Design a protein around this ligand. Structure first.
Ligand code: MG
Ligand code: MG
Ligand code: MG
Ligand code: MG
Ligand code: MG
Ligand code: MG
Ligand code: MG
Ligand code: MG
Ligand code: MG
Ligand code: MG
Ligand code: MG
Ligand code: MG
Ligand code: MG
Ligand code: MG
Lengths: 294, 52, 159, 169
RNA sequence: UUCCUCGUGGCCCAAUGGUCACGGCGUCUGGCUUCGAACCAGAAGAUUCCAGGUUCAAGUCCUGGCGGGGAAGCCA
RNA sequence: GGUUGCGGCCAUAUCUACCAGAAAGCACCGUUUCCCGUCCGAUCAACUGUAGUUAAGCUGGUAAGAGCCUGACCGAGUAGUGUAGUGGGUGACCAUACGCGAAACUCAGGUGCUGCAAUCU
RNA sequence: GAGAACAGAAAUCUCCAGUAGAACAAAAGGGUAAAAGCCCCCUUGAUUUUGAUUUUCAGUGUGAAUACAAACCAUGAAAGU
RNA sequence: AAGCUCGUAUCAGUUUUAUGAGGUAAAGCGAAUGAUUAGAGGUUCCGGGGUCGAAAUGACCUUGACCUAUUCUCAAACUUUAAAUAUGUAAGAAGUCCUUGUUACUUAAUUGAACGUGGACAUUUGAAUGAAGAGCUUUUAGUGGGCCAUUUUUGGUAAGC
């Protein structure tokens, strides 16, 4: 009835490319990101892409070619258990840790790890990775936040701060970090440092612990089940950071199976196409029955 | 909008004399102004007494 | 009065396409242009900045300058009884590599291959291209292909 | 089947279409905040009609959005004003419904003479959970055919809950 | 043919883009008179000659049509 | 082979109506102290992954489906057009010689391919 | 298109469809959908120094426009503009 | 006209190969815009109406819209598609490949960019045909009312307009 579009409309319709149809890429942003100064002929532009799905965080370094994009290194949230983090795999601190991980991962595989050590005595101060004198002018990369909404205190910038302390040079102002005083234009390092170490979580423990117990039970259940205390939350993060700076080399999984076996089961499981000869028989039978007086 | 124009000085014209006669009982005096080459005077009268 | 603007008589020449409106695909910005590349010009109507004048549509020239967002091109223009070279500055959206060269230097490297290989045993490599030669003799059998006799068709109205 | 496709209220929209701005406009706005606990918003007119006596952007009407248990509370408090009976045509074809009332004083604010007397227009937007698929920014999509509300579903839900009835048709 | 002008209450006309719009005569009700006038209190009535575009609003701003009136038409 | 992140070509990829989806992923989904934003924690912000569900999103399949794409001595060597004649015709126009060559229409076939990295009974 | 008191063909609000059939100071034509359209926040690059180039062209001028360099700035978290 | 530098070339009113651009001819309107003849089926909580009706979100007809599927004909300032003829560029020595030198530019980086050293590849050195010599400079006369023919085409009924 009303749910009908004319042939002329369907024949004159323009479709978005593919990604604008799926609503995943801002091509208006991609323009400004991947475009390279034409006098710098083949010098690629590397992007720090950060995405935030449920229960996981993704960080990658991507350059672009005509045939497709190419990635240097990637760092996911779910590998933190290797480095001593088991819960809150998407919190602000988890983001900062991931940014640190990918930072050391890249500089390690690029040979820029001994130089440009980064920042170790983290204090929530706003400082950039300055170039060492007569040195290799540290690596440069830009954020690619995608469709994610920019806002003060957003956890996407936690990855930025993770990389910047990790040793990468990421150009940025500080007026979007959490703790940025608004009516007067300054930053609060104490609050920023607290966020870097989960301060807003360890602090949030105390109220629920002193006000409502079943609420303290259903969420943070893993904390009780594994005996982690509010005060102990900073320590595990600090112990982690050293592990990342010790070995970011991205040990992969073992997969306990093969590519072929996975293919075999999916191949046998998925519905297949129907051949033209069968389709013709099917319609012929449909005439034979429905039109054939049943 | 504004409270200005201590200008035109109320032309001596007999139509203006009738305007002044009909003024003191009120009814929403409308007046027109002509300001060619700066030198300006009030030429025409009109009434719009609704206030509703 | 008469009217000769900068974009006069460009009503159809700058219409974009059918079902190809919207933004430009990134491959254009991913292209790399060197000095000395020979390149055609086709104005994109969606990018008003750095457009070429309508006369240069469909022309081909040589790159002589590269800047952050544009490319300097040399075009030969016939005026009067001679040619004058004109120097342009065009954003990459009105720019695409002329594949004529891309095809050409494949020949150059192919001839290099044949020349060296044939030089290894001296058999007169014979690099030059030749036009379509008149076809040489051949024999045609009728086996299972007995010739068919045709005849003119009479007139019928067919309406 | 029916695992988790239960029907719930998104929002209640309360509208008062004052034909002009000014003091009466302010007095009308002064009503809603006691009923809601929210700050109301006053909507402008989009073109002149010159017979209703409105200019463009003359800021004629007021409306408020209320959601959650507060919303269903106000909805219940209005249904008693309608004595739990609504005529059929009031129910939208997409599963929403609404009705108008007079004399907002029939609930809450006794009279409070500085305000005066005003009527309202309660309206309800109705669907199933998981509807943010059409509201999020990333991967925006449309809801499936079988998962949409309808006249038949909304009527039956309005009977089974609030144990009310529908009029002639 | 051109150019110009005009068309608005029953009649003659006036009109500030910002109120269905103004005057005078005319019409209606009541009063005075034996009665009609004159006179005294009060009212009402207009698709601004036909269609579009602009404006937020168009009698008005303008473009397209109908009817009326005026001027021009000379050197041979 | 499935899934996710970033893509390239930009409908064979869109649209309508139904059906199916192990595992993982994605998703919906729970809460409001903190950073943050709204009439409204609906979007956006933050926390948990715990309380649940494949209903939806998404993927795939089905339709003498719309559309889209490719092809054919189907239409058609037709329409049109470059060069020549002391060619025809009163004329409008039309054939011939050497060349190029459509669109509509009909029929047949198809209904995304692919790069990098990560994960999956 | 379907619904809500006064409210009706035209007042405000909600849902569904909606390739632009609207809007972008003006005449007309191109161009534009997470925008070039609507709303909001901050600003003055509508700045300084002369050069090169395109149109009209004699390859003169004027008008208009394009791409840089050397400074000082605006905006955005950033690439950028 | 005066010549000058050189001696078969840094050529050409030409064709071929390769590769670009165009919106005319044609064609189309059951494809966007506009025009336009005709019937058919629905839809009126909703046009004008009439009949049964007091009316109904009742029924039956008729005329106009509205929608759906069809039908006849059109566009210099309409269009999906789209010729023929004309038109841009390339077919090497000012070239190709290998190695490493300069830079205050650029790169995360001797990474790139541009310009070079040295080494290797010649008359089949990279399609056809011709080349009557090729290139370059100065100075000055006359001219700046045109007309005719084929083809395309504007105003006009038309014209030796
Ligand atoms: Mg943006
Ligand atoms: Mg074109
Ligand atoms: Mg009387
Ligand atoms: Mg924007
Ligand atoms: Mg000039
Ligand atoms: Mg043309
Ligand atoms: Mg034609
Ligand atoms: Mg056609
Ligand atoms: Mg048409
Ligand atoms: Mg050609
Ligand atoms: Mg002389
Ligand atoms: Mg001369
Ligand atoms: Mg002269
Ligand atoms: Mg003369």
């Amino acid at each position: 009835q009303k749910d009908a579009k004319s042939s002329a409309y369907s024949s004159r319709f323009q479709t978005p490319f593919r990604r604008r149809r799926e609503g995943k890429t801002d091509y208006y942003q991609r323009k400004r990101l991947v475009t390279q100064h034409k006098a710098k002929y083949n010098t690629p532009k590397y992007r720090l892409v950060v995405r935030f799905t449920n229960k996981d965080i993704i960080c990658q370094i991507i350059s672009s070619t005509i045939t497709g994009d190419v990635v240097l290194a990637a760092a996911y949230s779910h590998e933190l258990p290797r480095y001593g983090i088991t819960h809150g795999l998407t919190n602000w601190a988890a983001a900062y840790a991931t940014g640190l991980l990918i930072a050391r991962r890249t500089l390690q595989k690029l040979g820029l790890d001994e130089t440009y050590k980064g920042v170790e005595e983290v204090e929530g101060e706003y400082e950039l990775t300055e170039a060492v004198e007569d040195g290799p002018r540290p690596f440069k990369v830009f954020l690619d936040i995608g469709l994610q909404r920019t806002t003060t205190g957003a956890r996407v910038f936690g990855a930025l701060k993770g990389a910047s302390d990790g040793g990468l040079y990421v150009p940025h102002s500080e007026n979007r970090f959490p703790g940025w005083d608004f009516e007067t234009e300054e930053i609060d390092p104490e609050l920023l440092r607290s966020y870097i170490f989960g301060g807003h979580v360890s602090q949030y423990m105390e109220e629920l612990a002193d006000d409502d117990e079943e609420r303290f039970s259903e969420l943070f259940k893993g904390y009780l089940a594994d005996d982690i205390d509010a005060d102990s939350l900073e320590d595990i993060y600090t112990s982690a950071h050293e592990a990342i700076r010790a070995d970011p080399a991205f040990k992969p999984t073992e997969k306990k199976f093969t590519k072929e076996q996975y293919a075999a089961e999916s191949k046998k499981y998925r519905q297949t196409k129907l051949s033209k000869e069968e389709r013709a028989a099917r319609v012929a039978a449909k005439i034979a029955a429905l039109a054939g007086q049943q | 909008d504004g409270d200005t124009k201590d200008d035109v000085k109320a032309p001596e014209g007999e139509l203006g004399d009738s305007l002044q006669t009909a003024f003191d009982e009120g009814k929403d005096l409308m007046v027109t102004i002509i300001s060619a080459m700066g030198e300006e005077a009030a030429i025409s009268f009109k009434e719009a007494a609704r206030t509703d | 009065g008469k009217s000769h603007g900068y974009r006069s008589r460009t009503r159809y020449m700058f219409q974009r396409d059918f079902r190809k409106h919207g933004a430009v695909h990134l491959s254009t910005y991913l292209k790399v242009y060197k000095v000395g590349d020979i390149v055609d010009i086709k104005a994109n109507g969606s990018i008003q900045k750095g457009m070429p004048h309508k006369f240069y549509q469909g022309k081909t020239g040589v790159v002589y300058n590269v800047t952050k967002s544009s490319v300097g091109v040399i075009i030969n223009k016939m005026v009067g009884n001679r040619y004058l070279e004109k120097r342009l500055n065009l954003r990459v959206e009105h720019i695409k590599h002329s594949k004529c060269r891309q095809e050409f230097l494949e020949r150059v490297k192919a001839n290099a291959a044949k020349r060296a290989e044939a030089k290894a045993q001296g058999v007169a490599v014979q690099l030059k291209r030749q036009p379509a030669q008149p076809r040489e003799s051949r024999i045609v059998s009728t086996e299972g292909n007995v010739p068919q006799t045709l005849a003119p068709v009479p007139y019928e109205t067919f309406i | 089947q029916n695992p988790m496709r239960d029907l719930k209220i998104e929002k209640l929209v309360l509208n008062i279409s004052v034909g002009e701005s000014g003091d009466r406009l302010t007095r009308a706005s002064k009503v809603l905040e006691q009923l809601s606990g929210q700050t109301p918003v006053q909507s402008k007119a989009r073109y002149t009609v010159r017979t209703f006596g409105i200019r463009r952007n003359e800021k004629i009407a007021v409306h408020v959005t209320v959601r959650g248990p507060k919303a269903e509370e106000i909805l219940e408090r209005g249904l008693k004003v309608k004595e739990y009976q609504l005529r059929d045509r009031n129910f939208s074809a997409t599963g929403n419904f609404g009705f108008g009332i007079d004399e907002h004083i029939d609930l809450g604010i006794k009279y409070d003479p500085s305000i005066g007397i005003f009527g309202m227009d309660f309206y309800v937007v109705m669907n199933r959970p998981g509807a943010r698929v059409t509201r999020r920014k990333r991967c925006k999509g449309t809801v499936g055919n079988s998962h949409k509300t309808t006249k038949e579903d909304t009527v039956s839900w309005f009977k089974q809950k609030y144990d009310a009835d529908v009029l002639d048709k």
